[PDB]
From a paper:
The RNA-binding motif protein RBM5 belongs to a family of multi-domain RNA binding proteins that regulate alternative splicing of genes important for apoptosis and cell proliferation and have been implicated in cancer. RBM5 comprises multiple domains, including an arginine/serine rich (RS) region, two RNA recognition motif (RRM) domains (RRM1 and RRM2), two zinc finger domains (ZnF1 and ZnF2), an OCRE domain (OCtamer REpeat)32 and a glycine-rich domain (G-patch) at the C-terminus. Notably, both of the RBM5 RRM domains are non-canonical as they lack the consensus aromatic residue in RNP2, which might impact their RNA recognition. To study how RBM5 recognizes cis-regulatory RNA motifs, we investigated the roles of the three RNA binding domains (RRM1-ZnF1-RRM2), which are connected by linkers L0 (7 residues, between RRM1 and ZnF1) and L1 (20 residues, between ZnF1 and RRM2).
Residue numbers in the entry: 4 to 119
The structure:
């Protein structure tokens, strides 16, 4: 599927949330609605981030304009579409498309992780 939210996987753990957002600027395409680096309970990066866009085509054009040019520290970064993952709100599973309660960490149907 295609969506407004974009999942960047395999990011170097040494990379901070400010390093990403500054790099998000000066990129081609519509500037995103938000840039979300997922961190640990200690605060260290979990290695993946969420880049949300306002409309659908702003995400596809950004996916189209950067699915070859997103290299950081020499390592290519995987780029996948993802259902919206906003703070506090409900989330649709990416593996079985079921809508889950917001406080649910694992999926109700297939048990897939919220960020899997
Ligand atoms: Zn599921």
């Amino acid at each position: 599927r295609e969506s407004k939210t974009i999942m960047l996987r395999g990011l170097p753990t040494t990379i901070t949330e400010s390093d990403i957002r500054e790099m998000m600027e000066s990129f081609e395409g519509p500037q995103p609605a938000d840039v979300r680096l997922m961190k640990r309970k200690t605060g260290v990066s979990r290695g993946f981030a969420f880049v949300e866009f306002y409309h659908l085509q702003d995400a596809t054009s950004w996916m189209e304009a950067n699915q070859k040019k997103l290299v950081i520290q020499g390592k290519h970064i995987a780029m996948h579409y993802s259902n919206p993952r906003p703070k506090f709100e409900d989330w649709l599973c990416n593996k079985c498309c079921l809508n889950n309660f917001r406080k649910r960490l694992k999926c109700f149907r297939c048990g897939a992780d919220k960020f899997d």
